[PDB]
UniProtKB/Swiss-Prot annotation:
Brain and testis. The chain holds residues 446 to 721 of 766 of the full protein. Monomer. Homodimer. Heterodimerizes with RAF1, and the heterodimer possesses a highly increased kinase activity compared to the respective homodimers or monomers. Heterodimerization is mitogen-regulated and enhanced by 14-3-3 proteins. Heterodimerizes (via N-terminus) with KSR1 (via N-terminus) or KSR2 (via N-terminus) in a MAP2K1-dependent manner. Interacts with MAP2K1 and MAP2K2. Found in a complex with at least BRAF, HRAS, MAP2K1, MAPK3 and RGS14. Changing E141K: In ovarian cancer. Changing R207K: Increased kinase activity and stability in response to EGF treatment. Changing I202R: No effect on MAP2K1-mediated-BRAF-KSR1 dimerization, however loss of BRAF-mediated phosphorylation of MAP2K1. It comes from the Eukaryota. Methylation at Arg-207 decreases stability and kinase activity. The active site is at D131. This is Serine/threonine-protein kinase B-raf. The modification Omega-N-methylarginine is found at R207. Protein kinase involved in the transduction of mitogenic signals from the cell membrane to the nucleus. Phosphorylates MAP2K1, and thereby activates the MAP kinase signal transduction pathway. Phosphorylates PFKFB2. May play a role in the postsynaptic responses of hippocampal neurons.
Length: 257
């Protein structure tokens, strides 16, 4: 009846520092092979740091799905640490905007389908991601989407009610962020690339004066995908579909290719 989440003491090792994440540092490590380890640098955590760790473990431990980054376990001795699978590859952001990988339409639609599958799973478990974006979508072996929270470089994916600010976060604000990921996949670009001012973007998206230019979608982008993108991006949160409907739309347009 137990999940045995707590990793035995003196087993995890960490190597290369790969980044920063929420409460600490992310390393490539070893625990029954390659793993990613998010570890608190200090030995004595503040009650807040400990609470942030417990909340993150509580969310991750409820997930078991191929499209969610695999949570493996946690340790509190000698330091607070969360262990996940190690993914070989790059995030969708890195692919589209750094190394500019050119995916075929069938593969772009499949990345969208798998992300919607993972998001539908999280929402069914009442988990609102709050920071869905292409950098939080990992292409494991550059084939399987793994949603995680790897990391303000998140305004482009922010729903207008989240920009405006209370609790503006909902399943619908995650749907909007997914709409932006759909825009990235179908255009190969980040929205608002011709606006060099962050304050203006924040202000205008929040007022509904500015929205992504859907005419930028590739020519081989199906019409139903463009319509789905438009629905996910609705300025009013109540007008946006939820992931079971988004999933059904993607599955159908993928069969019609
Ligand atoms: C090691 C580690 C521990 C915890 C998390 N925590 C999440 O992923 C997360 C937190 C809350 C909710 C959710 C979700 F999505 F379920 F809602 C996910 C991420 C990492 C992690 C893994 C790989 C990484 C990395 C960090 N940074 C990096 O560059 N690589 C390549």
């Amino acid at each position: 009846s137990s999940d045995d989440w707590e990793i035995p003491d003196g087993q995890i090792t960490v190597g290369q520092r790969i980044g920063s994440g929420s409460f600490g540092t992310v390393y490539k490590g070893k625990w029954h092979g390659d793993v990613a380890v998010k570890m608190l640098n200090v030995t004595a955590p503040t009650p807040q740091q400990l609470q942030a760790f417990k909340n993150e473990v509580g969310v991750l431990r409820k997930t078991r799905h191929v499209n969610i980054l695999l949570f493996m376990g946690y340790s509190t001795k000698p330091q607070l640490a969360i262990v996940t699978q190690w993914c070989e590859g790059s995030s969708l952001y890195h692919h589209l905007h750094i190394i500019e990988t050119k995916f075929e339409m069938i593969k772009l639609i499949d990345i969208a389908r798998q992300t919607a599958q993972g998001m539908d799973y999280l929402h069914a478990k009442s988990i609102i991601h709050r920071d869905l974006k292409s950098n939080n979508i990992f292409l494991h072996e550059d084939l399987t989407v793994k949603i995680g929270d790897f990391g303000s470089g998140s305004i482009l994916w922010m729903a207008p009610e989240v920009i405006r600010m209370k609790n503006p976060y909902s399943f619908q604000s995650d749907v909007y962020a997914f709409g932006i990921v759909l825009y990235e996949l179908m255009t190969g670009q980040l929205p608002y690339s011709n606006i060099n001012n962050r304050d203006q973007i924040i202000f205008m998206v929040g007022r509904g004066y500015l929205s992504p230019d859907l005419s930028k979608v590739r020519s081989n982008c199906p019409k139903a995908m463009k319509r789905l993108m438009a629905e996910c991006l609705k300025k009013k949160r109540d007008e946006r579909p939820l992931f079971p409907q988004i999933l059904a739309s993607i599955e159908l347009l993928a069969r019609s290719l």
